[PDB]
Amino acid sequence: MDHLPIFCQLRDRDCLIVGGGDVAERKARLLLEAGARLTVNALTFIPQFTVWANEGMLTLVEGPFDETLLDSCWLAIAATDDDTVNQRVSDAAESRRIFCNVVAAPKAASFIMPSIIDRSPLMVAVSAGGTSPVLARLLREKLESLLPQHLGQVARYAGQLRARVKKQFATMGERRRFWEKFFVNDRLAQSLANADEKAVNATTERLFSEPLDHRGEVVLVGAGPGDAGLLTLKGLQQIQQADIVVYDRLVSDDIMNLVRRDADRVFVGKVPQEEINQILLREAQKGKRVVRLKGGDPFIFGRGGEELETLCHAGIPFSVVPGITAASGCSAYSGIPLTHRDYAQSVRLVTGHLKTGGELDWENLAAEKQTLVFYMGLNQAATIQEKLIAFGMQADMPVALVENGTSVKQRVVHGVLTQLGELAQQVESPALIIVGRVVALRDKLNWFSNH
Amino acid sequence: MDHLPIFCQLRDRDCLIVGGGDVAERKARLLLEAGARLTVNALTFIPQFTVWANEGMLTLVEGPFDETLLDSCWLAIAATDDDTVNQRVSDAAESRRIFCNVVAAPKAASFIMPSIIDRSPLMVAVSAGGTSPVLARLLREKLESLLPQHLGQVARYAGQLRARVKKQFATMGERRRFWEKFFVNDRLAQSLANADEKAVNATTERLFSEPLDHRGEVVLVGAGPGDAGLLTLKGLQQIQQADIVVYDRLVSDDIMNLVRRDADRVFVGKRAVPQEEINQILLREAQKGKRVVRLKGGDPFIFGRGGEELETLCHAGIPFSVVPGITAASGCSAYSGIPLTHRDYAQSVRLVTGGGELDWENLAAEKQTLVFYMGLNQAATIQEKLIAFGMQADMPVALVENGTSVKQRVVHGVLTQLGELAQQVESPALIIVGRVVALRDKLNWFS
Numbered sequence: 001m002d003h004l005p006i007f008c009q010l011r012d013r014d015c016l017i018v019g020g021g022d023v024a025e026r027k028a029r030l031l032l033e034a035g036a037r038l039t040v041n042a043l044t045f046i047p048q049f050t051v052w053a054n055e056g057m058l059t060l061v062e063g064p065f066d067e068t069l070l071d072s073c074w075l076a077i078a079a080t081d082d083d084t085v086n087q088r089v090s091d092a093a094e095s096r097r098i099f100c101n102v103v104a105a106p107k108a109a110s111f112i113m114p115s116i117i118d119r120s121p122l123m124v125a126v127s128a129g130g131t132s133p134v135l136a137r138l139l140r141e142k143l144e145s146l147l148p149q150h151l152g153q154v155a156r157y158a159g160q161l162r163a164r165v166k167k168q169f170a171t172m173g174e175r176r177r178f179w180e181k182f183f184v185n186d187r188l189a190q191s192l193a194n195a196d197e198k199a200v201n202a203t204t205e206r207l208f209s210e211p212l213d214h215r216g217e218v219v220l221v222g223a224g225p226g227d228a229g230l231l232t233l234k235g236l237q238q239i240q241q242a243d244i245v246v247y248d249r250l251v252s253d254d255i256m257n258l259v260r261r262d263a264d265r266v267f268v269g270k271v272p273q274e275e276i277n278q279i280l281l282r283e284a285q286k287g288k289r290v291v292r293l294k295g296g297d298p299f300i301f302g303r304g305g306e307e308l309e310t311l312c313h314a315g316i317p318f319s320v321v322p323g324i325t326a327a328s329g330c331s332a333y334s335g336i337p338l339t340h341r342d343y344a345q346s347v348r349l350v351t352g353h354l355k356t357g358g359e360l361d362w363e364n365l366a367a368e369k370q371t372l373v374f375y376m377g378l379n380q381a382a383t384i385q386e387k388l389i390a391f392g393m394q395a396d397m398p399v400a401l402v403e404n405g406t407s408v409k410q411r412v413v414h415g416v417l418t419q420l421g422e423l424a425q426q427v428e429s430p431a432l433i434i435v436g437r438v439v440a441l442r443d444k445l446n447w448f449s450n451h
Numbered sequence: 452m453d454h455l456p457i458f459c460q461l462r463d464r465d466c467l468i469v470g471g472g473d474v475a476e477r478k479a480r481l482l483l484e485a486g487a488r489l490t491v492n493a494l495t496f497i498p499q500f501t502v503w504a505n506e507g508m509l510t511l512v513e514g515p516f517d518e519t520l521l522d523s524c525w526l527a528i529a530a531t532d533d534d535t536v537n538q539r540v541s542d543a544a545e546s547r548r549i550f551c552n553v554v555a556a557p558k559a560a561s562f563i564m565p566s567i568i569d570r571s572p573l574m575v576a577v578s579a580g581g582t583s584p585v586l587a588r589l590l591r592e593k594l595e596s597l598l599p600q601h602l603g604q605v606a607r608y609a610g611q612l613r614a615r616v617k618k619q620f621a622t623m624g625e626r627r628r629f630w631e632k633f634f635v636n637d638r639l640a641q642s643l644a645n646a647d648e649k650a651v652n653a654t655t656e657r658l659f660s661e662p663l664d665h666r667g668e669v670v671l672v673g674a675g676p677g678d679a680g681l682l683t684l685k686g687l688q689q690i691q692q693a694d695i696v697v698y699d700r701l702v703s704d705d706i707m708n709l710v711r712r713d714a715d716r717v718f719v720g721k722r723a724v725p726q727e728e729i730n731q732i733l734l735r736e737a738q739k740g741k742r743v744v745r746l747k748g749g750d751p752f753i754f755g756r757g758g759e760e761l762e763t764l765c766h767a768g769i770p771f772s773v774v775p776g777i778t779a780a781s782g783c784s785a786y787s788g789i790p791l792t793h794r795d796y797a798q799s800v801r802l803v804t805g806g807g808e809l810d811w812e813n814l815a816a817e818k819q820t821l822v823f824y825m826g827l828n829q830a831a832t833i834q835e836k837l838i839a840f841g842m843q844a845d846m847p848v849a850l851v852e853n854g855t856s857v858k859q860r861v862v863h864g865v866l867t868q869l870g871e872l873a874q875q876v877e878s879p880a881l882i883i884v885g886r887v888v889a890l891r892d893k894l895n896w897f898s
C-alpha cells in the first residue's frame with residue numbers, strides 16, 4: 001500500500017502549523033479538536049487565529065519560518081502559498097524525523113490528511129492520496145449514508161463494558177461471541193439513543209447471562225475460480241471472521257488479501273489428504289474458527305466430503321459455503337455459454353485422471369447434444385482426442401482450453417477436436433477443456449478480453 | 452475526536468518492531484506492504500522472520516531490547532508478551548517523540564492501528580479507539596463487499612485524466628457527472644486490470660463522446676439459488692450501481708431486498724411472457740442510456756437462456772458483461788450435504804433438463820451423478836426408463852426443493868420410490884440420482 005493509516009493520539013503533544021490563511025485555519029481546527037499543543041508560525045493571520053489565541057488555545061508566532069520551532073514537535077504542517085517556504089519546512093521536518101504534511105504537495109512530505117467521518121469514538125478515514133479527490137468525496141458521502149447516527153453510543157458503551165467483559169469471560173472465543181451479539185442488537189441501539197437506562201440494563205443483564213458456545217467450527221468455503229469478485233458474500237463473512245485459514249495452490253493472491261490480517265494461514269499445496277484431515281481436525285480442537293478455503297466449489301472435485309466425513313463422528317460442528325465452480329467461471333469469461341437452446345441438453349463435468357485403473361466410459365462421453373468439461377485433463381488431452389473420435393464424435397467439433405479462467409492472466413485457445421492435442425501443449429495448469437458446439441458462440445459472446 | 456487519523460508514507464523509513472512471534476509477524480507484514488525499512492528486535496524469531504531476513508526484506512537484531520535501535524526511527528510497535536518490555540519500548544519512543552503502538556494495549560500508546568481497506572492509492576481505515584475492535588471488523592467486512600478490487604486502478608487513471616476533464620467540461624456540476632459514470636464503468640475497470648490498452652482508449656473516448664446522461668450497458672448477473680448470502684461480490688456491486696433491474700420469480704426476495712431502492716424494477720417472470728419480449732425490454736431500456744442489470748436465478752449460462760439474451764444485444768453494439776452465479780446443483784448439493792462427487796463413486800456429474808428426446812441408455816450408465824433441472828413433471832416416466840435400461844433399483848435418489856433457502860425441503864430414499872417422492876415437492880426442485888445421495892446421513896448440516 002502507498003500509505004500506512006495510523007490514528008495518532010495528539011493530547012498534549014506539540015505540533016507546528018506554518019502559514020496563516022483559510023487553509024491553515026482548517027488544519028488548525030482539526031488539530032485543536034484532537035487536543036494538540038499547537039503553534040502557528042506565519043507572517044500574517046486571518047482573524048480566526050486572532051480569536052483562538054485570545055482564548056488561549058494556540059500560540060501565535062508572527063514572522064518568517066523559524067526552524068527551531070520544530071524541535072519539540074510530533075507533526076508539522078506546511079500551509080503557505082510559498083513553495084520555497086513549504087519545502088524549507090518539509091526539509092526541517094525530515095532531518096528531525098517529524099511527519100510533515102504539505103497542503104499544496106500531496107506527493108512530497110510524510111503524511112496525508114484524509115477526509116473524516118465522525119461517529120466518535122468511531123472514525124472512518126477516506127483518502128485517494130491526491131490522485132482522485134473527486135472519488136474521495138464520492139466515497140466519503142456514500143459512507144456517510146451507511147453508518148447510523150447512534151453508532152457512536154453503541155461504541156462508547158462498548159468501551160465502558162470492556163472491563164466487565166474481560167473479568168467475566170475467560171477465553172478469547174467467548175468474548176468474541178459476546179461482542180458479535182452486542183453489535184447486532186437493534187433494541188440495545190435504540191435504548192442508548194433514547195437514553196433509557198432501565199432498558200439498557202435489562203438487555204445488558206440478559207446478554208452477560210447467556211451460555212456461550214465453546215465449540216470450534218470448520219467451514220468449507222468455495223473460493224471460486226480466481227477473480228476475487230466471484231467470492232460469495234457468505235464466504236467473505238467467513239474469511240473476515242476466521243481464526244485459521246487452510247488454503248491451497250488454487251486460491252489466488254487476490255482472494256488471500258481478503259483474509260482477516262490477524263488470522264494465521266496454513267498452506268496445503270506443494271501434502272496429502274489424510275494430513276489435511278488431521279491438521280483441520282487438530283486446529284479445530286483448540287476450539288477456534290477454522291476455514292478450509294478451496295478453489296472452485298468444494299463438492300465438485302475438491303474432496304470436501306473426505307474432510308467433513310471425519311467430523312460428523314468427532315462431534316465437531318461444520319458447514320459449507322458453495323463457490324463458483326471453474327466450469328461456470330470459465331464459461332462466463334470465455335464467451336462460451338454452457339447450455340444454449342438445444343446445442344446441448346446436458347453438461348458433463350468430467351475428471352481428467354481416474355483412480356489408477358478404471359477407464360472413462362468413452363461411449364457415454366461421446367454422445368451428442370452435450371457440453372463436455374474436463375477437469376485436470378491437460379496431461380491426458382491426446383487420449384481424450386483419440387477416444388472421442390473412436391466413439392463417434394465428429395472431427396470438426398470445436399474445442400477450447402481456458403487456462404487460468406477469470407484472472408487477469410487468462411489465456412483461451414480454441415480449435416476443433418483434431419487439434420486438441422497440440423492446443424494442450426501451449427497451455428499449462430490450471431486449465432479446463434471445453435468440448436461442444438457452444439464453443440462456436442465464443443466469437444459473439446466474448447466480452448472479457450483479447451488476452 | 453481524540454485520535455487524529457493520518458496516512459503515513461513509510462517507504463524507505465526506519466520503523467521498529469520489538470518482538471518476534473505471531474503478532475509481530477502480522478504487524479511486520481503490514482509494515483512491509485507499505486515499504487517500511489524495517490528492523491525487528493526480539494529474543495527469538497518464528498521461522499517466517501528468518502525467511503524474510505534471507506530475501507533481504509528486513510533486518511533482524513537478536514537479543515534484549517536496545518533503545519538505540521530507535522535512534523533513526525519514525526514508528527515503533529511493541530508486540531511482545533512481556534508488559535515490562537512493552538512498557539520500556541513505549542517509554543523509549545515518547546522521549547524521542549516516535550509515534551508508537553502497543554498491540555496489547557490501545558491506551559498508553561501514541562497511535563492505534565485501525566482496520567484498513569486497501570485499494571491503493573485509495574484507502575479507507577476504520578477504528579473506534581480500542582473500544583470496539585469487533586465492530587470495526589464488521590465495518591471492514593461490509594466495506595470490502597462494496598469496493599471493487601480494481602477501483603485503485605481507475606483511481607489512478609483518473610489522475611492524468613483531470614487534464615482533459617476541463618477542456619471538455621466547463622461547469623463543476625457536469626464535471627462531477629462525468630466523474631460519476633467514470634468510477635462505475637466496470638468495462639473501463641476490467642480493461643485497466645487486464646492491461647488491454649486499446650479497450651481502455653475505446654472506452655475513454657466513448658466516455659467523452661456519448662452524451663452525459665448516457666451510460667447504457669447490460670450486465671447479466673446470477674442471483675444464485677435463493678440464499679442472499681450466495682450472491683457474489685461483483686454481483687452485489689453491480690446491483691448497487693443499476694439504473695434498472697429486470698428480474699423473474701426464480702430470484703428470491705432476499706436478493707431483491709439488496710437492490711438499490713431508487714432503481715426501476717421490471718418483473719418479467721410468470722404470474723399464474725416469451726423469451727423475445729424479455730430480449731426487447733432489455734434492448735429497449737439499454738438504448739435509452741440506462742445501466743441495465745438482468746438478474747436471473749442461479750447461473751445465467753446454465754439453462755437460463757443467458758446466451759439468447761446476449762445475442763440480441765450484440766447486434767446493436769451494446770456493451771455487456773456476465774457475472775456468473777451459484778447454479779442450483781452447487782447450492783442444493785452443499786445445503787443438503789450431498790456432494791456431487793466423492794471418492795470413486797462418480798467420474799462425472801451430469802446436469803440435465805426435463806425439440807428432440809433424451810438419450811436414455813446414457814443416463815443409466817454407472818459411475819455418474821445425475822442432476823435433473825425442471826424435471827418434477829417428467830419424474831414419473833424417469834423412474835420407469837432408468838429401471839427399464841438397467842439401473843440398479845436400490846440407487847439412492849433425492850429431490851431438493853427451494854434449496855439453500857429458509858424453507859428448503861429435502862426428500863430422499865431409493866429409485867423404486869422416485870415417482871412417489873416427486874408428488875411431495877413443487878418447483879423449483881432438483882432431482883439428484885446416484886450413490887452420493889447416501890452421504891447426506893453424515894453430511895447434512897443444514898436441517
Ligand SMILES: Nc1ncnc2c1ncn2[C@@H]1O[C@H](CSCC[C@H](N)C(=O)O)[C@@H](O)[C@H]1O
Pocket residue numbers: 225226250295296297298299300301302324325326327330374375376377402403404405406430431432
Ligand atoms: N481458474 C481455473 N481455470 C481453468 N481450470 C481450473 C481453474 N480452477 C480449477 N481448474 C481445474 O480444476 C482442477 C482441480 S479439481 C478442483 C476444482 C473444484 N472442485 C471446482 O469446482 O472448481 C484443476 O486441475 C483444473 O483443471
Ligand SMILES: Nc1ncnc2c1ncn2[C@@H]1O[C@H](CSCC[C@H](N)C(=O)O)[C@@H](O)[C@H]1O
Pocket residue numbers: 676677701748749750751753754755777778779780783823824825826851852853854855878879880881
Ligand atoms: N432454489 C432452488 N431449489 C431447487 N431447485 C432450483 C432452485 N432454483 C432453481 N432450481 C432448479 O432450476 C430450474 C430453473 S431453470 C435454471 C435455473 C438457474 N439458471 C440455475 O442455474 O439454477 C428449476 O426447475 C429447478 O429445477
Ligand SMILES: [Cl-]
Pocket residue numbers: 578579580581582583584587
Ligand atoms: Cl476500536
